[PDB]
């Protein structure tokens, strides 16, 4: 079983987006009006699932082959790689990194998405990878395209890949979005602007990695994820 031997650095809730951010319309009715109640960390909060024994398929991380109906997806072949570290710079090994995206045209494989851009018969848009001993992950996919959504009359989401990271605990668990370097739609999106600090928006922007690119094949993007810092318990209960 799991034990209570770790403490996590408290979240800076002024760095992270606020619950109530009006320009992102759906946040008005889906945000708490009452204050969050602060509780100390215990075994319920400091522990979490370990996915080392989960049965991963051979192409779970490869979106170019995991849907395959007899061909290759249309779109910019890219590699999305990086490292998962904590606030102290310590690597987070054997952690679950999950991802989902749209196709080259901005169409997502869900029944509720009625955007006129067609579906790609060879692309699903789902990926999972377990980080190695040094905290590294890697995905192979196509660069997603932007898409419109009913918020403002002419709001367009920037090209993005949604990320889900587990970490050593439920306290570290995070869902976020990766954006691509130089996309002019980034300073215009109300979901991006939900984050007040401009330096925080930069941590979500994946940088072009020519060094990790496969010549004559595919390009690459680097996206490092920083989770809550883990430290040992000291001077507790006297």
């Amino acid at each position: 079983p799991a034990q209570d031997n770790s403490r996590f650095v408290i979240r800076d809730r002024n760095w992270h987006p606020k619950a109530l951010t009006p320009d992102y319309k759906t946040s008005i009715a889906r945000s708490p009006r009452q204050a969050l109640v602060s509780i100390p960390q215990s075994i319920s909060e400091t522990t979490g699932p370990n996915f080392s024994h989960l049965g991963f398929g051979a192409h779970d991380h490869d979106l170019l082959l995991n849907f395959n109906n007899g061909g290759l997806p249309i779109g910019e072949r890219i590699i999305v790689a990086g490292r998962v570290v904590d606030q102290y710079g310590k690597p987070v090994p054997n952690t679950l990194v999950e991802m989902w995206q749209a196709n080259a045209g901005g169409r997502e494989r869900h029944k509720n998405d009625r955007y006129l851009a067609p579906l790609d018969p060879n692309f699903g848009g789902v990926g999972r990878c377990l980080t190695d001993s040094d905290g590294y992950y890697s995905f192979r996919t196509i660069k997603p395209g932007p898409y419109p959504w009913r918020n403002g009359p002419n709001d367009w989401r920037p090209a993005h890949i949604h990320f889900g990271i587990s970490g050593p605990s439920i306290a570290t668990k995070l869902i976020t979005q990766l954006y691509f370097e130089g996309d002019p739609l980034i300073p215009m999106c109300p979901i991006v602007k939900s984050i007040a600090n401009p330096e925080a928006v930069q941590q979500l922007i994946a940088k072009l990695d020519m060094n990790n690119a496969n010549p004559m094949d595919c390009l690459a993007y680097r996206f490092d994820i920083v989770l809550r810092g883990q430290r040992k318990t000291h001077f507790e209960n006297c």
Binding site: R33, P49, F51, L54, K173
Partner: protein, 200 residues
């Protein structure tokens, strides 16, 4: 002061969170092994229960695109971190509400008692994390049981909530769904009878 590396900012899970984290619920084909709502297999120790609920926004309307993650101890009060689909019990599970089923369901056992950092026993609880479109950073809450009134009155976490009327929102009502023991836990994100959300 001492500043560390900043944590990667949170973003909404989006309306189509189901394609990456709930493939079956998204009407897409599933992979060999999935993380879903079956925490306990029929031959697992403890009292087998069924959990259900609906998620409401500030206008009293149903949130049909919510995604929930649960973390609970077993009947003996221990957290099973090693996730495997061959195990009789897993401490982790995922559920959701779809347009087809605006009600989430979870098949598990009633958790045992676990102690806090100071050695004081906490009442039987289930840790819940709520993700959906419109929710920028996920909401943390706890599910308590109404038939554990004696343990709930002594819980050091539940007693941190200043007003007793707000503690009742964290209490799941006992009912029966198809002649089986069940508990109903409705979450009200905003407004009248708002659910207590935590920060840790």
């Amino acid at each position: 002061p001492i500043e560390l590396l900043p944590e990667t900012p949170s973003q909404t899970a989006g309306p189509y969170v189901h394609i990456g984290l709930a493939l079956e619920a998204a009407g897409n084909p599933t992979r060999d092994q999935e993380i879903w709502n079956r925490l306990a297999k029929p031959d697992a120790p403890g009292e087998h229960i069924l959990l259900l609920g609906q998620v409401y926004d500030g206008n009293g309307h149903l949130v049909r695109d919510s995604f929930l993650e649960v973390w609970q101890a077993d009947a003996n009060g221990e957290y099973q971190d090693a996730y495997n689909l061959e195990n009789a019990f897993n401490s982790f599970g995922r559920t959701a509400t779809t347009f087809d089923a605006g009600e989430w369901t979870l098949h598990t056992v009633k958790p045992g008692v676990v102690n806090n950092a100071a050695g004081v026993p906490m009442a039987p609880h289930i840790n819940i994390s709520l993700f959906a479109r419109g929710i920028n950073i996920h909401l943390h809450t706890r599910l308590y049981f109404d038939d554990e009134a004696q343990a709930n009155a002594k819980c050091p976490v539940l007693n941190l909530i200043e007003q007793p009327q707000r503690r009742e929102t964290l209490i799941a009502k006992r009912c029966e769904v198809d002649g089986k023991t069940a508990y109903r836990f409705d979450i009200r994100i905003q407004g009248e009878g708002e659910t207590v959300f935590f920060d840790f």
